[PDB]
Design a protein around this ligand. Structure first.
Ligand SMILES: [Ca+2]
Ligand SMILES: [Ca+2]
Ligand SMILES: [Cl-]
Ligand SMILES: [Cl-]
Ligand code: NA
Lengths: 56, 223, 223
């Protein structure tokens, strides 16, 4: 479940969010998936974790 | 369109199909030379197809006009989908008739609870995949801004509104993007985004067109 | 704070440490009973630690005051981090002295290029993890709105501004959140978020305090 653009708050723990846009991005490793209704769809995951995944 | 109905041939004369080798988005004809769609539908080599019903069969009323210019909104935010509106100019003016007609821009924003018509060639299944060939229609009310933000906390801007049913079952889906949301004969919304299709508490989100009439008029007057 | 320096004991008398069994965020004292921090730093059972230098040794100038009330901004957006500001009321009024003093709220917003002071007990390594115990300081200029949005396309709101260096090496980091960004003696920023620490083209983003003077004044006047 990689992530290339990860933004975190500077708190303890940090609150991190992945801003990647993918044509699927709706893994089971994403609780809240948001997609445009186009072909292909542009999907983003607005989940908030305390970490960042490895890049892609 | 999930849980909708077959519109009937050419009963939505402002609905257009955007084709780049296949239908990838919808659009709305606002005059003989300009189409309004979603900014996230942008791609090169767009062919605008007017007067379409069955998008897979030439039925004799189609007008296939290539785009000469696409103009994404200057403040379109692909990260948040804010300002998700795009103008498409046709290489040649279309022949406006009964089956190919423009839709009027709003002079005032629509209120919550207004019934609107949402149409498109998008997926008709909430769980699965089935793409229709004829145009599907859906009558859906505009939801309050508060309930829209309640469905998508922190994601709804002043340029978006929700429409549909919080109990799910009726919604727009993949393939409907850029299509019209017409309320009282005015183009009030553009099919934008959502979480799944026809899911409970996940209504479709639409670009609030009434906030862009000024930019739309000035852009087409200078292009 | 990455690429900074040791402030010196109590040279930042408005700097606060928020403790919930450990240091988790910073804050700024704006009067004897109120602290300004970041909304994402919210948690229950906050203890406010004033007069701190070394946060692991009682040095004789500290004041430990429990939070009586926390007030997250009414429009704080945990997804976009817009309106990332929080008011914390002290259970008892702190005694103000040379080592414990309040910081002034801004009368006008600071301009780009203004050198500001950023401080906190956050991580000091850009690639690694080493947390200091004494307060670290960093002088950093405010960056323009254009360059801030250029670093984070589609994510900088009118309530945020970037500060630091596009070449990296100097920035705030994990543990500095809620801390002050003071420019010309006025609290202009709150340590909010970023992409990593001290990374090239990834400067720190801060809450634009000047857009909240009205809310801050009326809230503490009625609480
Ligand atoms: Ca056809
Ligand atoms: Ca101490
Ligand atoms: Cl960090
Ligand atoms: Cl308010
Ligand atoms: Na008090």
């Amino acid at each position: 479940p990689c992530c290339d653009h990860c933004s975190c708050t500077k708190s303890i723990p940090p609150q991190c969010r992945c801003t990647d846009l993918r044509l699927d991005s709706c893994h089971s490793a994403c609780k809240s998936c948001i997609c445009t209704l186009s072909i292909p769809a542009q999907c983003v995951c607005d989940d908030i974790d305390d970490f960042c995944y490895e890049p892609c | 369109i999930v849980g909708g109905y077959t519109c009937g041939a050419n009963t939505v004369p402002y609905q257009v199909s955007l084709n780049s080798g296949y239908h990838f988005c919808g659009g709305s004809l606002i005059n003989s030379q300009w189409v309004v769609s979603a900014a996230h539908c942008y791609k090169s080599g767009i062919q605008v197809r007017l007067g379409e019903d069955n998008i897979n069969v030439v039925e004799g009323n189609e007008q296939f006009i290539s785009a000469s210019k696409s103009i994404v909104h200057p403040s379109y935010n692909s990260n948040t989908l804010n300002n998700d509106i795009m103008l498409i100019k046709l290489k040649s003016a279309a022949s406006l008739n009964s089956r190919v007609a423009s839709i009027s821009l709003p002079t005032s924003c629509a209120s919550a609870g207004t019934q609107c018509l949402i149409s498109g060639w998008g997926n008709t299944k909430s769980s699965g995949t089935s793409y229709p060939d004829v145009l599907k229609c859906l009558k859906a009310p505009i939801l309050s801004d508060s309930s829209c933000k309640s469905a998508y906390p922190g994601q709804i801007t002043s340029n978006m509104f929700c429409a549909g049913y919080l109990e799910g079952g009726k919604d727009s889906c993949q393939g409907d993007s850029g299509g019209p949301v017409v309320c009282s004969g005015k183009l009030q919304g553009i099919v934008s985004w959502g979480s799944g299709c026809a899911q409970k508490n996940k209504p479709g989100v639409y670009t609030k067109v009434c906030n862009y009439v000024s930019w739309i008029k000035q852009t087409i007057a200078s292009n």
